């Protein structure tokens, strides 16, 4: 599953719903520490709609318990994530990944 640590608190009242567009800037990471990706490297923050299963199943589960404006660290089981086969060249097989998102707004 995901376990979400906060970093710094949102308005601890709106939280996303299905059907929502949210908007957020996040930096992954591998169990060693290393980047992989980073919306904020691109300065420019990414959009999904919650439920449309266009993200892993982690940020789906994990960014609907944060609120908006607040910033989370998640730690991601590969069941979550990308699974036994990884993402060759990207993702190693059964890896864990850990991401420091902060939600910016819902659109
Ligand atoms: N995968």
Redesign the pocket.
Known sequence: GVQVETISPGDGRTFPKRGQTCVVHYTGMLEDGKKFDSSRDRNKPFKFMLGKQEVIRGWEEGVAQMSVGQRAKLTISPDYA??????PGI?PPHATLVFDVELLKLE
């Open positions: 990308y699974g036994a086969t990884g993402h993702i």
